Design a protein around this motif. Structure first.
Motif, mmCIF file in Angstrom:
data_model
loop_
_atom_site.group_PDB
_atom_site.id
_atom_site.type_symbol
_atom_site.label_atom_id
_atom_site.label_comp_id
_atom_site.label_asym_id
_atom_site.label_seq_id
_atom_site.Cartn_x
_atom_site.Cartn_y
_atom_site.Cartn_z
ATOM 1 N N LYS A 79 1.191 -1.074 0.241
ATOM 2 C CA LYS A 79 -0.019 -0.355 -0.121
ATOM 3 C C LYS A 79 0.427 1.559 0.228
ATOM 4 C CE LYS A 79 -4.738 -0.691 1.230
ATOM 5 N NZ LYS A 79 -4.724 -1.755 -0.055
ATOM 6 N N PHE A 80 2.290 1.126 0.231
ATOM 7 C CA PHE A 80 3.052 2.185 0.472
ATOM 8 C C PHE A 80 3.702 2.714 -1.176
ATOM 9 C CE2 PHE A 80 4.075 1.564 5.070
ATOM 10 C CZ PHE A 80 2.371 2.148 5.464
ATOM 11 N N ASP A 82 1.858 2.238 -4.043
ATOM 12 C CA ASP A 82 0.435 3.007 -4.811
ATOM 13 C C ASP A 82 0.263 4.740 -4.867
ATOM 14 O OD1 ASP A 82 -1.031 3.861 -2.886
ATOM 15 O OD2 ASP A 82 -2.583 2.398 -2.457
ATOM 16 N N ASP A 84 -1.852 6.975 -4.170
ATOM 17 C CA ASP A 84 -2.608 7.255 -2.666
ATOM 18 C C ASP A 84 -1.444 7.662 -1.934
ATOM 19 O OD1 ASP A 84 -4.396 8.607 -0.975
ATOM 20 O OD2 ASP A 84 -5.557 6.691 -1.457
ATOM 21 N N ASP A 87 -2.885 7.213 3.198
ATOM 22 C CA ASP A 87 -1.998 5.889 4.151
ATOM 23 C C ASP A 87 -0.872 6.146 4.451
ATOM 24 O OD1 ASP A 87 -1.284 4.568 1.807
ATOM 25 O OD2 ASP A 87 -2.597 3.538 1.577
ATOM 26 N N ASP A 88 0.275 6.177 3.386
ATOM 27 C CA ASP A 88 1.687 6.446 3.282
ATOM 28 C C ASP A 88 1.432 7.666 4.589
ATOM 29 O OD1 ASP A 88 0.918 5.864 0.497
ATOM 30 O OD2 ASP A 88 3.029 5.650 0.559
HETATM 31 ZN ZN LIG Z 1 -0.132 4.976 -0.860
#
Ligand SMILES: [Zn+2]
Length: 121
Positions: A79-80, A82, A84, A87-88
């Motif tokens: 998820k780190f 993408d 977006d 959340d990062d």
């Molecule tokens: Zn991300």
């Protein structure tokens, strides 16, 4: 995604000032950390860093390599990767809570003096 200095600046608005740290310092650091690449992956023999900030799979996130990761940020690592950064950025807000800005060694070494060159406008 390869990001430009100004895209970063824009997309780290929610980090602006957090823990007393300023967006130029963030730009300058993200740049030295990732070259503004939200999809940078450095897989070492034992740990692996992800995304614009290079968050390691051994403390904050969880992946297939370190399943005994604390997963402090409660989140899968990819998820780190993408585009977006929502959340990062909450992960990084934890890292400031728990360690803080010197957790990234580039900041004091390179992102502290000449912040003028990291401003967008
Ligand atoms: Zn991300």
């Amino acid at each position: 995604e390869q990001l430009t200095k100004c895209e970063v600046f824009r997309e780290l608005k929610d980090l602006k000032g957090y823990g007393g740290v300023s967006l130029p310092e963030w730009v300058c650091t993200t740049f030295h950390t990732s070259g503004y690449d939200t999809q940078a992956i450095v897989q070492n023999n034992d740990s692996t860093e992800y995304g614009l900030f290079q968050i390691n799979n051994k403390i904050w996130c969880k992946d297939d390599q370190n399943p005994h990761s604390s997963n402090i940020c409660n989140i899968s690592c990819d998820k780190f990767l993408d585009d977006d950064l929502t959340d990062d950025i909450m992960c990084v807000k934890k890292i400031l809570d728990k360690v803080g800005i010197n957790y990234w060694l580039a900041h004091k070494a390179l992102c502290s003096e000449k912040l003028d060159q990291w401003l967008c406008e």
